[PDB]
Design a binder for this molecule. Structure first.
Ligand SMILES: *[C@@H]1O[C@H](CO)[C@@H](O[C@@H]2O[C@H](CO)[C@@H](O)[C@H](O)[C@H]2NC(C)=O)[C@H](O)[C@H]1NC(C)=O
Ligand SMILES: *[C@@H]1O[C@H](CO)[C@@H](O)[C@H](O)[C@H]1NC(C)=O
Lengths: 176, 56
């Protein structure tokens, strides 16, 4: 997809993530588990809901064919009537099929964008307090218990709190 | 239908308080019944070979 996340650097989706479209899986001394990102999920639902409504609203006034009859010496106007009615039905068939293919392309890229932005939201909070593994996961250089994990998921991660613990660990590793 | 003669029919809408006057010395197919328009609204003449389906 355009944003490189879904079936991209994140190899596949999670059957285990049932309560959000995008979210997290963590593992620490306390255990492991899934959690939805409810904010990005809700934003995306709102966008798709509006999209569906927009598409239907804009098609709300389109052409309505009406039966009209003509006698055997009104063939020219009969033919003009047929072409006119068919002409609008072709315009509107095109408008609907095309709009649906275009918006479908945009919806699937919108999801990819949302996953990418969630990953970056975590990446830019953690900075060098964790290692990027390249597969959508981060390995922390400090212990990160459940309240700490929740601070990452809710955008309140406190980098200064853990920066010295992480520095010591980064140095241990880099010193070999 | 067995006949070489032809009947040609005509119609008009006669507005309230107007009158229609006929005069003829032959070949006249005269009105007996006419149709008062008592309800106007959306309708259509739909071309179909189907008949009533007893549904709504
Ligand atoms: C059809 O009949 C009505 C009578 O019921 C005629 O209207 C009247 O015309 C007279 C004038 O001769 C007036 O005094 C009445 O007030 C009218 N009545 C109404 C209800 O308008 C009407 O002229 C007749 N139509 C024609 C074309 O002869
Ligand atoms: C975010 O998570 C932390 C858990 O460590 C919690 O203390 C805080 O109340 C949460 N804040 C918001 C804004 O939800």
């Amino acid at each position: 997809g355009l944003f490189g996340a879904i079936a991209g650097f994140i190899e596949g989706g999670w059957q285990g993530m049932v309560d959000g479209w995008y979210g997290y899986h963590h593992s620490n001394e306390q255990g492991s588990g899934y959690a939805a990102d409810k904010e990005s999920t809700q934003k995306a639902i709102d966008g798709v809901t509006n999209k569906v409504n927009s598409i239907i609203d804009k098609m709300n006034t389109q052409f309505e064919a009406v039966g009209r009859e003509f006698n055997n010496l009104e063939r020219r106007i009969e033919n003009l009537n047929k072409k006119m009615e068919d002409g609008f039905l072709d315009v509107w068939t095109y408008n609907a099929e095309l709009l649906v293919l275009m918006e479908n392309e945009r919806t699937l890229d919108f999801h990819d964008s949302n996953v990418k932005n969630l990953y970056d939201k975590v990446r830019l909070q953690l900075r060098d307090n964790a290692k990027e593994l390249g597969n959508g996961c981060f390995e922390f250089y400090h212990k990160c218990d459940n309240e700490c994990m929740e601070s990452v998921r809710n955008g309140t991660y406190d980098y200064p709190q853990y920066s010295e613990e992480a520095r010591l660990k980064r140095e241990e590793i880099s010193s070999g | 239908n067995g006949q070489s003669g032809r009947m040609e029919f005509f119609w008009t809408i006669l507005k309230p308080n107007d009158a229609i006057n006929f005069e003829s010395n032959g070949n006249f197919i005269a009105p007996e019944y006419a149709y008062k328009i008592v309800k106007k609204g959306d309708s259509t003449i739909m071309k179909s070979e189907l008949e009533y389906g007893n549904c709504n």
